[PDB]
Amino acid sequence: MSLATEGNGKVIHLTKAEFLAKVYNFEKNPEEWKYEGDKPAIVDFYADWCGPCKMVAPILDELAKEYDGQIVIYKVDTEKEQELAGAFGIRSIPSILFIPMEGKPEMAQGAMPKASFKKAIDEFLLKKEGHHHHHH
Template sequence: MPEFLTKDTFKEKIFNFEENKDWKFEGDKPALIDFYADWCQPCKMVAPILEELAEEYQGKIDIYKIDTEDQRELAAMFGIQSIPSLLFIPVDGQPQMAAGALPKETFKKAFADVLKVEEPA
């Protein structure tokens, strides 16, 4: 299951923005963050896909969710304008944002291209 992040767990697991000006990923494996809201229909379409991917890629990729209604500071920090917005975070390099409800195959392609994680056999 994807893990829900708050400001505190975000600083611990993703990026401690209070200590670092420049991006410094705190995680030990690639991650995906889903910025969503409970009222958002496309977000509801993405949720079961992310649950499947969390199982399939368990131990290879960490999948997180951030409620933009509850965690407004985090949403503002990333300039979230539309949801769902999906942040792909490689272990090395800059994160990349994608917007909209993506199909499962697109996630898998991004995992391979951006996160450098191949599909589990």
């Protein structure tokens, strides 16, 4: 049945329920952050009525496919996921949550271009020089 359902190397918009299961349990972890993901994730907080929020989807699709295998990109519809976005203090949009496999996730506000995104994805999410890195 599921031989090739994409998803990996893609950007999927999900709900807080989907967030919960594969990303983060804000039920058991009201205050803390336990990542349930196996690969590094990038969560785009977007609102369709927002221009920038629209741009990031194609950008994210591009970079997701470019960095396929290693990363998995998501996005969340803040207009409905108000509780989810509000919990992190995101307020609304745009916010980009970079979730490492080590530590807690950083965020960048707004839909930066393919170039700035590559730097944040590659040289930060994979090249986590700011995570546990003092020299060794």
